[PDB]
Design a protein around this ligand. Sequence first.
Ligand SMILES: O=P(O)(O)O[C@H]1[C@@H](OP(=O)(O)O)[C@@H](OP(=O)(O)O)[C@@H](OP(=O)(O)O)[C@@H](OP(=O)(O)O)[C@H]1OP(=O)(O)O
Lengths: 243, 31, 89, 52, 183, 229, 141, 98, 35, 97, 30
Amino acid sequence: EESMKWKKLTNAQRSGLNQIPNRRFTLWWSPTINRANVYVGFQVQLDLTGIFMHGKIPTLKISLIQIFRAHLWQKIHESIVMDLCQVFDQELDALEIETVQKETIHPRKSYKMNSSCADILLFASYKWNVSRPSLLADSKDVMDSTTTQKYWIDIQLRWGDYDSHDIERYARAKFLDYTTDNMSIYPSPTGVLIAIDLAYNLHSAYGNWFPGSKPLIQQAMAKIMKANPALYVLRERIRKGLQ
Amino acid sequence: ENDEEEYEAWKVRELKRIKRDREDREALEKE
Amino acid sequence: KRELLRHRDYKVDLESKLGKTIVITKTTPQSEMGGYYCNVCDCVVKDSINFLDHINGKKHQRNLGMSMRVERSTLDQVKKRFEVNKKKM
Amino acid sequence: DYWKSQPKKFCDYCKCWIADNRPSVEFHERGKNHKENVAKRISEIKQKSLDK
Amino acid sequence: ANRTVKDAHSIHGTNPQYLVEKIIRTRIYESKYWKEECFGLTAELVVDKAMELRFVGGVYGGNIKPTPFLCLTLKMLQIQPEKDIIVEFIKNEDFKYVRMLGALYMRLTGTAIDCYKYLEPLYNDYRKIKSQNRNGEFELMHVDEFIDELLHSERVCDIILPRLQKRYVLEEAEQLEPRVSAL
Amino acid sequence: QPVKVRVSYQKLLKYYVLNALKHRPPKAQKKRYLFRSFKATKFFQSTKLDWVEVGLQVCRQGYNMLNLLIHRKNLNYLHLDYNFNLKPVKTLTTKERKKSRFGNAFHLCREVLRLTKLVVDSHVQYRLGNVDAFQLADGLQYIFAHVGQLTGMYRYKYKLMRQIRMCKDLKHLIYYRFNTGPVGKGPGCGFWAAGWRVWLFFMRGITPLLERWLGNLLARQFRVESHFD
Amino acid sequence: SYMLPHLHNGWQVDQAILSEEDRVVVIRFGHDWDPTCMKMDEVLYSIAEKVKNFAVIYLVDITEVPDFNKMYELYDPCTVMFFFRNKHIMIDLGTGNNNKINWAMEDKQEMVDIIETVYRGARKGRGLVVSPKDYSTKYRY
Amino acid sequence: ALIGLMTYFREAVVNTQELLDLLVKCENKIQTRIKIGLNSKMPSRFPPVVFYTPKELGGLGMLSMGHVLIPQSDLRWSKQTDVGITHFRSGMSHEEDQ
Amino acid sequence: VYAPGLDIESSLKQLAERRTDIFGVEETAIGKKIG
Amino acid sequence: NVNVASLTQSEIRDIILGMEISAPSQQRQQIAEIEKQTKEQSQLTATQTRTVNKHGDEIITSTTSNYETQTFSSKTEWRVRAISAANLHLRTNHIYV
Amino acid sequence: FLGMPAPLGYVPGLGRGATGFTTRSDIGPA
RNA sequence: AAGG
RNA sequence: AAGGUAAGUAU
Ligand SMILES: O=P(O)(O)O[C@H]1[C@@H](OP(=O)(O)O)[C@@H](OP(=O)(O)O)[C@@H](OP(=O)(O)O)[C@@H](OP(=O)(O)O)[C@H]1OP(=O)(O)O
């Protein structure tokens, strides 16, 4: 922006270059302008992204297209799934996991918020004892609800606005909706859904838990959020857009 | 066993149908 | 010479290749590419639903020497179908 | 915040613009329309040569 | 195909398939069951598919997903069967679901005279059946209950049935004999 | 009396005075009759029918006309129900919901036909024996006193706030002259003449606009101080 | 308004769109007698010499040449459309109609900027360009 | 412009009721200008935080000569700790709108 | 860039034909040509 | 462990000076892959998965885009365990009898 | 070319492969 | 590739 | 009721 300020440019070029401050301002406050409470109307899902536009905010849309270029959303989902795969592979014997399988899924699986499939499938050497569904932060688990031999993990990414950024409520709703509808198909009734708020860097998980799954996955997700490569790319892109 | 339970359910359904017919007739009778 | 429409006696293996991975190169023609393919109409479709739409389409039936018209059934054959279905089980 | 436009390729035979990467280019070239346009261009070139 | 057969005549002054809502018709036309097992169905083929029915219902789930029973009903609306075919469906005794499909078609397209002439005698059936709710859950009811819903409920299996002249009105004009129940 | 009915009286007097002031003698004209000229052409026949039957016929014809208008550009994803509610058959894409756009005139016609459908349906319910004559009268009174609730006419022409406010004022007047003495509050007022008159006087003025719009749409074909230099 | 070249049939309009390979074909659909068209044509005449390196301006009477009324929805008093290499270049003006300029402008520099943006976007191979100025409001205060 | 006006007529504005209505009208006009610059459609409710936040924190650094209420729904925030996620609000004890 | 002289004259003649509020003797509407 | 012949003049100047050509970390290598578009991405592999359309209909689709296609080589996968069991006699020489 | 007449049997729409557009349904002759 |  | 259409290439 500084270099072009002193170059020979036409009026259209200079008019286009005076919008970058407005784009920076719009994206700085984006979790506030881009709200369904602020702009009452229908939602449009940004292509290649899980971002819903509650109104035509081209000043914000243009700068959101840059941040999620080169399929950043898909790469973030894939990296988180892979990291959880290594986390569960490192704890095969302690958790009595006979094998950890990363399920084949749609390339646009992270994009589809209407319904979702399992991301990581866990098989048990012997049947696990499954607790009633509970949040990741919650620690009061009876751990005696039912039993299973297949455990699935769902990774959900979202771009929360100011009003809707309660990641725990989002995880609860997604688990109680995908596991109880006729759209989402899962290998087993028991599983956990992990929701990530990319706009606020909030993470949570709702669903069943087997002994040792929750205590491991807590700091697993914490470290993933702290030091993910694709998450770091998103952070740096947001910082560069915000200057 | 299963046949007896089926017969009991069929008799209950027939009684319910008789009651429904009586109610339908009484709807016109009252009005 | 367009014969009347007839029901498909064979099920379609929509979920036959679930989870499978198919390697495709430049030389590989449409026959062995991923997705669904019909030789009758020589086309490739990458959906189960779109493949069902295609095999239910006008052009696919036309390439089979067929027509979209469905024959009106008769009472005798309906009764005989009832009889044979009852006898089968 | 600098905008880098993705390269675009113009298919002369079909007179259309496509993305300049291997997947999009190969998908366009493998299509029926591109093959028909290429054959038509070859036929027109031969006809023009004979007419000349 | 998807349109009504040419030889078919109008029902209630409209297209025979139009007895079902356009939303539900569009959902049925896009269903996997309709595109797979209902591409071309004659009366024989409908009979063949009718016995495979395991439940009766309309649509279920958050998204409108039709049951095979509704798809077969719409198929019979599309390709019009003759009245004697409907009676033979109703006259069936071994299979309850085929008789229910015939009764539903008779209620949809038959005259108000026919809805009491051919469906009221089915009150003698009390066979237990499974009915799928709009939430995807299945519940148990009986044949007589389904006939009562057909003859008295405006909406059955997510279909708004055509208006019926009331039974006492039909009895007063004495063109239909009053129903004499077995009990 | 409550404040609302006093404001009702004042607003009714305001409308009366404004009508009296703005009155102008009718302009001289040659007597031309639309229905007489309809009879002259061969496209129209005459008969005598029950009013309820003609109401059903007019409702069906208006529904058919609107369906013809809706499916003019082959917009198969828009469905008009029999209560005249325009609803989509699927989850419309943004381009789909942009191309499925109609002017305020179309929606005003749709809501007018919806009001007629409501009236004819009330009369049919009376004829079917479902509702009583007193119930039919009370329902007709509720229809004209609550057009803003039953239909969304004011959204597509905000000048109908005048008609809606006048209907509310007449409702207040008739209710507080009616629910007096032993008679208390609740449904059963009836006396639907006032709102009926109000909305027919609305129709006599809204007719030419809709005639012009429909004629333009259904046809085969579709100062100095500024530019003196 | 009368100094600009005119096209007298649909074939002439097609040829004018087809002839120019390196310039934007700006065509105004309307009537020389319509005041809105008079304003737009005066604006186009004021800039005709300036943009002659990358734009050519033609005027078409939609009554004399009705071959594009149904196609291009030319049911407005004035309409300006942009074509580059036999492709209609849409522009996001912010008015809800991205296909044409259906009003009359008052600033020559405004129209020149729009023409330049269309030219650049079409040269890059784009079917839609974003106007440098929004027209969701008239900026009247 | 606003401080040039106010610091000049510091004592005379308050008795001038026509000026109080003019300041609010002009402030709302420029806020509407910013809102329509953001999106074409007008928001149903637009938070004052984006307007009146000082430019140091990314806001516009707006100065106000009007009575603008901040909804209590815009004073709540949450941060994620190690044990879990904790929700916070500003202006507790169920006070009136700030 | 600009139209030739005869074309300018023809365009002005068409404008005068279709603008009777400026030209002609009788005055029809802005767009009409009959009078 | 590099050859001096392949070093360019700029690299030689950097070596002579104190400029440090540090090898990017494993985290930094992953960041570069994510930050940049896939190099000459070739959709040579097609995967069929059971998904839903935009109207909520279960559908079987074949996709070639190289996303969500990374293979997780686990310690339980037989491919890893095969080379793990290779040269197993190393554990045989040292025992705790 | 300017001044030249249109060739007989020429459709000015598909002669150059032009594609139309629709902004709304209340505009245009069906 | 499928729909009127 | 709008000022909320990505522009495509394939099937
Ligand atoms: O327009 P309002 O004077 O407010 O009338 C409303 C109400 O109307 P809504 O259904 O539109 O809310 C009833 O009026 P009707 O619908 O019956 O015409 C009701 O009437 P009754 O209880 O007398 O039947 C009652 O009106 P009233 O003030 O005459 O009691 C009530 O008024 P409030 O909302 O002021 O209670």
